[PDB]
Design an enzyme around this catalytic site. Structure first.
Site, short mmCIF file in Angstrom:
data_model
loop_
_atom_site.label_atom_id
_atom_site.label_comp_id
_atom_site.label_asym_id
_atom_site.label_seq_id
_atom_site.Cartn_x
_atom_site.Cartn_y
_atom_site.Cartn_z
CG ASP A 1 -10.07 23.70 -43.39
OD1 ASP A 1 -9.44 22.95 -44.17
OD2 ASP A 1 -10.49 24.82 -43.73
CB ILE B 1 1.10 1.76 -4.91
CG1 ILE B 1 1.62 0.35 -5.16
CG2 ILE B 1 0.31 2.28 -6.10
CD1 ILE B 1 2.79 0.29 -6.12
CB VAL C 1 -0.97 -0.02 1.19
CG1 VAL C 1 -1.68 1.32 1.32
CG2 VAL C 1 -1.99 -1.13 1.02
CB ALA C 2 3.75 2.30 2.05
CG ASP D 1 -5.73 22.31 -45.31
OD1 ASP D 1 -5.27 22.24 -46.46
OD2 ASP D 1 -6.95 22.44 -45.10
F1 BEF Z 1 -5.21 23.03 -48.63
BE1 BEF Z 1 -5.86 22.10 -47.56
F2 BEF Z 1 -5.66 20.65 -48.07
F3 BEF Z 1 -7.36 22.38 -47.37
MG MG Z 2 -8.56 22.88 -46.19
#
Ligand code: BEF
Ligand code: MG
Length: 871
Positions: A611, A273, A270-271, A317
């Site tokens: 996105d 851990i 117990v101790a 992106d």
């Molecule tokens: F340019 Be990303 F692929 F929307």
């Molecule tokens: Mg895009």
């Protein structure tokens, strides 16, 4: 049986063949019974806890605690058994909460040809072989083979990242996702007029379906914090098992009783851990999630908050995350020669037109106002609620007219003759008559490519008067067009006149998909912070290079790699090329996944901020999945681990700073809790070895670890973070939490606590038998050692006087609560009965405080020595 054709197969075969296999009707549509049968077979046009809780019991520490509980219940120790059971339940619940990923976060209305056209229909109701119509501002419901498309262009920014709308044709292609001009894939808005097609795919067989299957096949990598904690748990389990075994065999050689050794091994397990460590870590991460929710970011998993503090590479992106995905008229060049710069981003009134450092509104500058009017009059696109229904360039011109305050100029003109825009024509001309006076002669407004407009123009305007065009003026206009083209802008020539062939050239406008507001500053700050930012997109080389140069990722000597080269490149040479380059263009979702996996192979912690649908696989493969809250698609927001609600990149820096602070606090209270656990384990081992009775039982150890050292640790987890902590560059994820200095401090604290507690226990031991006074002295001494260790554990370098005793109000309240609880334990008669303790005199409390201040004094002495040595 009517199979679903792959998009490439549908594009390859002609229209008649596609309709023949799909058994479609081009004109009449589909019979209701056939639609019902195909819906029953294929299904709708859609795509998509106890075991998680049980899996927590697989942890070796939980197994050790269960072994302690069962050994306790074999004997008549009910209190220890119930206490260990409660501790196990709490630890399992908090671990499950930490590992739990939240999923708390109308169908597209498509008018297909069902029975004699004019059927409102729904997105789900489509079945393969159905004929569906398309129009302006209409999302594509399902992958349809275009058997009739007159002047059609489709925006595939979400699906493939191509900013320019894709021209669509009906004839079969001789032969890529973009190269299939016949097919119109699901989820892509239609910019141009009209189209009709046969629904080749429905559900998993769509391009969205293929990307979704790729996403589901991928597995999200474990966070660096989770890996570090798993390694720490493995180390703790090995240490505990080894210590228990060595003590058991050594004592058995010494001849101790077997039942006594079992009842002591219960306390040892117990101790050894630290039970409060997972609870405190989960509470700290939950508070971090709450802070991020306050800072316009929704984190879908608790460990993700610290993950951005360790990231080395951030990918992005280009279309829709770095860029607004909305075309804007950045530059205006009057035919006279005036240069005007236009602020603002997107289709909105916000921003103004600046001429020679002066903001121009309305008709203040006749030339620029005339150019804006000419651009605005000959438009079909209309903007409602900051949303565009029409062409992107026409929407950009409308937004520019809105910025000038001339948005009410389209109403003053009514069309008589309209010349449609064509692919070969490359120019749009419209004649209008001013509404107030019909006696005014016909005036024609034209826009389009510079070459055609300047071919149809014979005069140009200057200083309010018209002048005949000359070769020098044409050369100047061509040079300005080249200058705009080299800057990544798209150039439109605006002209007006009374009839075609007699127009007066008015000027030029430069249209670009601009970086989102504040993205440039945030990118520069992130790059200065030590994070290497890369751009991965499916767009062309010109647009990607222009945006990268504007944001600062790309230089003259820098390099850019296409997706095809990535596919051709071997794993090793891809691993050497990817770190060098910063811009990837024409990257398919599989190629984005390849890039991120090759980055992760080198050891970098990769975070992507996408996105689109093409970023779903890449987001899942990335260590951190960041998605845009508003523009992000459903699939992308599903594959993300954090979503930026306001689509702001300053949230990324806030997350990085919060992760750094959280990791620092985690190190602090990990040091504290392991010091306490090692001290308790060593005290029990030494007491057993030299024939002393066990000073601490399971109930007292659990009390100390959870009730007494819990609130102080959850206060150390919220200690304000120093600026130098968050100003450091991202750490290497291979580093362990337990540094050599941390282990040295933990061992020093453990040695001091063991010495003091053992001294008190032996001093109060009258005849080698535990008396309640001895129990309460040992208990209070250990609790006070823990409080002073928590006080001296606030920071590893800064002295507490440098920090300040009352700087952390939560820490002061937690310490006061723990002191009140200990006073109740040693004074409240029911708690005395529970813990077999006794009332203590004030002199004993003063002596205990004096003895327990030694650990704090030694900790500050070591801190001062380290500070002196560092200089
Ligand atoms: F340019 Be990303 F692929 F929307
Ligand atoms: Mg895009």
């Amino acid at each position: 049986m009517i199979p679903v054709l792959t998009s490439k197969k549908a594009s390859e075969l002609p229209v008649s063949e596609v309709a023949s296999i799909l058994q479609a009707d081009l004109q009449n549509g589909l019979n209701k019974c056939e639609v019902s049968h195909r819906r029953a077979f294929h299904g709708w046009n859609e795509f998509d806890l106890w075991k998680k809780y049980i899996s927590q019991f697989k942890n070796p520490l939980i197994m050790l605690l269960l072994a302690s509980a069962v050994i306790s219940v074999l004997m008549h120790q009910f209190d220890d058994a119930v206490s260990i059971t409660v501790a196990i339940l709490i630890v399992v619940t908090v671990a499950f909460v930490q590992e739990y990923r939240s999923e708390k976060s109308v169908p597209p209305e498509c008018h297909c040809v069902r029975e004699g056209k004019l059927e409102h229909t729904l997105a789900r109701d489509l079945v393969p072989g159905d004929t569906v119509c398309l129009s302006v501002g209409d999302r594509v419901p399902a992958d349809l083979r275009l058997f009739e498309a007159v002047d059609l262009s489709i925006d595939e920014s979400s699906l493939t990242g191509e900013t320019t709308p894709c021209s669509k044709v009906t004839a079969p292609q001789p032969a890529d996702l973009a190269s299939r001009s016949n097919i119109a894939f699901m989820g892509t808005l239609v910019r141009c007029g009209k189209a009709k097609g046969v629904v080749i795919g429905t559900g998993e067989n769509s391009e969205f379906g293929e990307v979704f299957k790729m996403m589901q096949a991928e597995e999200a990598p474990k966070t660096p914090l989770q890996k570090s904690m798993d390694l720490l748990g493995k180390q703790l389990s090995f240490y505990s098992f080894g210590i228990i075994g060595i003590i058991m065999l050594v004592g058995w050689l010494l001849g101790k009783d077997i039942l006594e050794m079992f009842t002591i091994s219960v306390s040892l397990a117990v101790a050894a851990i630290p039970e409060g460590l997972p609870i405190v870590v989960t509470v700290t991460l939950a508070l971090g999630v709450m802070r991020m929710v306050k800072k316009r970011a929704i984190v879908k998993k608790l460990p993700i908050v610290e993950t951005l503090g360790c990231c080395n590479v951030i990918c992005s992106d280009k279309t829709g995350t770095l860029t607004k995905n909305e075309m804007t008229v950045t530059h205006i060049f009057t035919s006279d020669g005036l240069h005007a710069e236009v602020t603002g981003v997107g289709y909105n009134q916000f921003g103004e037109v600046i001429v020679d450092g002066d903001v121009v509104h309305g008709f203040y500058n006749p030339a620029v106002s005339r150019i804006v009017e000419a651009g605005c009059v000959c438009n079909d696109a209309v903007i409602r609620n900051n949303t565009l229904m029409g062409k992107p360039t026409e929407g950009a011109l409308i937004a520019l007219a809105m910025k000038m305050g001339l948005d009410g100029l389209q109403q003053d003109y009514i069309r008589k003759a309209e010349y449609p825009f064509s692919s070969e024509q490359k120019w749009m001309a419209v004649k209008c008559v001013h509404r107030t006076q019909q006696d005014r002669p016909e005036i024609c407004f034209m826009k389009g490519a510079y070459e055609q407009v300047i071919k149809y123009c014979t005069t140009y305007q200057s200083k309010g008067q018209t002048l005949t065009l000359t070769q020098q003026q044409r050369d100047v206009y061509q040079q300005e067009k080249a200058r705009m083209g080299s800057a990544g802008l798209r150039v439109l020539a605006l002209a007006s006149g009374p009839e075609l062939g007699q127009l007066t050239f008015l000027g030029l406008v430069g249209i670009i998909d601009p970086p989102r507001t504040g993205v440039k500053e945030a990118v520069t700050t992130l790059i200065a912070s030590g994070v290497s930012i890369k751009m991965i997109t499916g767009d062309s080389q010109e647009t990607a290079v222009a945006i990268a140069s504007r944001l600062g990722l790309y230089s003259k000597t820098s390099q850019s790699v296409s997706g095809e080269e990535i596919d051709a490149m071997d794993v090793q040479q891809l691993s050497q090329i990817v770190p060098k380059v910063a811009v990837f263009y024409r990257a398919s979702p599989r190629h984005k996944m390849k890039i991120i996996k090759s980055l992760q192979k080198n050891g970098s912690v990769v975070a992507m901020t996408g996105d689109g649908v093409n970023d779903a696989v890449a987001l899942k493969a990335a260590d951190i999945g960041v998605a845009m809250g508003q523009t992000g698609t459903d699939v992308c927001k599903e594959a993300a681990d954090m979503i930026l609600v306001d689509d702001d990149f300053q949230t990324i820096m806030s997350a990085i700073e919060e992760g750094k602070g959280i990791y620092n606090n985690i190190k602090n209270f990990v040091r504290f809790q392991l010091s306490t656990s090692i001290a308790a384990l060593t005290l029990i081992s030494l007491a057993t070895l030299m024939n002393f009775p066990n000073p601490l039982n399971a109930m007292q150890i659990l009390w100390i670890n959870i009730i007494m050292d819990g609130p102080p640790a959850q206060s150390l987890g919220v200690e304000p973070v120093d600026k130098d902590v968050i100003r450091k560059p991202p750490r290497n994820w291979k580093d362990s939490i337990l540094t050599k200095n941390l282990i040295l401090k933990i061992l020093v604290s453990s040695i001091i606590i063991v010495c003091g507690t053992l001294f008190v226990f032996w001093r109060e031991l009258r005849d080698n038998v535990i008396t309640p006074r001895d129990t309460t002295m040992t208990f209070t001494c250990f609790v006070f050692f823990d409080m002073f260790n928590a006080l001296s554990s606030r920071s590893q370098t800064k002295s507490v006087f440098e920090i300040g005793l009352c700087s952390n109000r939560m820490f002061c309240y937690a310490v006061l609560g723990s002191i009140m609880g200990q006073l109740l334990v040693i004074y409240f008669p029911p708690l005395q009965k529970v813990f077999q303790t006794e009332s203590l005199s004030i002199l004993d409390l003063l002596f205990l405080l004096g003895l327990t201040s030694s650990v704090c004094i030694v900790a500050e002495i070591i801190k001062k020595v380290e500070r002196s040595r560092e200089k």
